[PDB]
Design a protein around this ligand. Structure first.
Ligand SMILES: Nc1ncnc2c1ncn2[C@@H]1O[C@H](COP(=O)(O)OP(=O)(O)NP(=O)(O)O)[C@@H](O)[C@H]1O
Ligand SMILES: Nc1ncnc2c1ncn2[C@@H]1O[C@H](COP(=O)(O)OP(=O)(O)NP(=O)(O)O)[C@@H](O)[C@H]1O
Ligand SMILES: [Mg+2]
Ligand SMILES: [Mg+2]
Lengths: 296, 292
């Protein structure tokens, strides 16, 4: 792993200036990195991990980080820099749009089927890249897709679970036997797609994680999203098959959700979809040049 | 046409006043995507002379061209807003322009850095020559820094819509060709090698065209060997067809950047900053995702 792809930061190089949110693994501040000997202050995203439980040695952390920093894909967020102190602080590119989950919740009325189906494509491509790299995310969820632009999404918090439980997003084998494979990540992908098709609903609402394994071991799955058709749900329902090797491979999902994007009026049904905002070329280039710029 | 976004004056909102010049004024702007909760830092250019609907037609037409300059080393016109007066939207560069940068880093700036900016500025200018475009307003002030290791040329085609940088023929006959930009390039390079000095300082603009014909040229920058100043001087030939072409200055500078100590003599060059691989990937990943 290119040991130059991860830059070691001294705590004096950057500043916390805001709290964007917290999760099971740490707190994420919006940050500013002042290049040594420069008057500019560049927007970053510091995530401070919480040690528990229980802690890795400084060297082993580096090794895992050198791997998270070696992630090169248009749809997978890469670890830019790290900071070892009394705590460990990860540094990534600041995403102003926030996570995808929050995005749809904000826009439950404005999304077109073209958008949704495309995000499933981008997430799948991203997960596929990770799969091809023999890397297991472990923690895939719609909260963990950041929106770079409304038409470009990426995946964060990769391999954090390896350093340091999202029960309602885990496949059965992960819950019961701590098994984590590219196929368990597929199940999580299914839940994520569910989250998207329901404009930010909560998986198993009211049902305590305590016994999610129970309902699952009894064949209980999530409601067929209101806007989905059978073609689509057949796929989701396939991602949640107790037999792991029965679930779709990511490369196949790319093709599946791609084929569906060819005519999104067919696989998805939405209020103003007949006339809802499709990404215009002249609009997309503006977004890309000003905010994106990365090869994809 | 997809390159130029006609912005509604609502979408964007000026904020800080970054500066003013010959062609207009610059503000730190904010593009607020119509349906989004995001505020995104841009760079706004309010042309200093107002404009009417007919001049607008001619303006957009150039604006499409400016929107099409797709080069890592030349700034692209992202969006435009026709109103009482025309407004242009480009990327905002926190590092500011290359001129103010050299002056506030005289002692920090080493061989490798200077000789590289030159190469880049040549690449950008060569791109404009390859596309038969005439910059007209080249100067260290027009060359923006994206990262201390990646510079870009701005205010292209703004002239079509400065004496001390202009070529002789530009001053005496308002002629602007690629070789006349090669002249402005020479002065630009000079600006840098002198860590920001003013060209022909103490000599009134109206009397600049004069001294040129008597054979007066900017002095050899204190840090320049003859391999370099020979090139700067060749850019200032009276015969336009005699000065270097941009495709050549790229080569000749690339030659020197592969052995910086020799062609540029700077005190404390031995300790001077080397752009480490990691520190670079950090800048690129964070700021310039255009593979610098
Ligand atoms: N690069 C980023 N840019 C902008 N916001 C970010 C970025 N990374 C994380 N966030 C925000 O950080 C907030 C919460 O931090 P986080 O640690 O990701 O919790 P989480 O991912 O929702 N829960 P978890 O599954 O345990 O990681 C999320 O809502 C994200 O929107
Ligand atoms: N994209 C940008 N990002 C940051 N600053 C910018 C950007 N574009 C222009 N500026 C600033 O705008 C300020 C004023 O420049 P301007 O009004 O274009 O005239 P100028 O730089 O003197 N060139 P000129 O046209 O010959 O007057 C400069 O100091 C730049 O630093
Ligand atoms: Mg997250
Ligand atoms: Mg300028």
């Amino acid at each position: 792993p290119n040991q130059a792809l991860l830059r070691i930061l001294k705590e004096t190089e950057f500043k916390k200036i805001k709290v964007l949110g917290s999760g099971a693994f740490g707190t994420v501040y919006k940050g500013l990195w002042i290049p040594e000997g420069e008057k500019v202050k560049i927007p970053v995203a510091i995530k401070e991990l919480r040690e528990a439980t229980s802690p890795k040695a400084n060297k082993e952390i580096l090794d895992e980080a050198y791997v998270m920093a070696s992630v090169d894909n248009p749809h997978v967020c890469r670890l830019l820099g790290i900071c070892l102190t009394s705590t460990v602080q990860l540094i990534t590119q600041l995403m102003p749009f926030g996570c995808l989950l929050d995005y749809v919740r904000e826009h439950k009325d404005n999304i077109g089927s073209q958008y949704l189906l495309n995000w499933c494509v981008q997430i799948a491509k991203g997960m596929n890249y990770l799969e091809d790299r023999r890397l297991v995310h472990r923690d895939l969820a719609a909260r963990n897709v950041l929106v770079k632009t409304p038409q470009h999404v990426k995946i964060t918090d990769f391999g954090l679970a390896k350093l340091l439980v999202p029960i309602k997003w885990m496949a059965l084998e992960s819950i019961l036997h701590r098994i984590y494979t590219h196929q368990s990540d597929v199940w999580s992908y299914g839940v994520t797609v569910w989250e998207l098709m329901t404009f930010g609903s909560k998986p198993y609402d009211g049902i305590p994680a305590s016994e999610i394994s129970s309902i699952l071991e009894k064949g209980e799955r999530l409601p067929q999203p209101p806007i989905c058709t059978i073609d689509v749900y057949m796929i989701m329902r396939k991602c949640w098959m107790i037999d792991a090797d029965s679930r779709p491979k990511f490369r196949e999902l790319i093709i599946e959700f791609s084929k569906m994007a060819r005519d999104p009026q067919r696989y998805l049904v939405i209020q103003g979809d007949e006339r809802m905002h499709l990404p215009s070329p002249t609009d997309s280039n503006f977004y890309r040049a000003l905010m994106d710029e990365e090869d994809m």
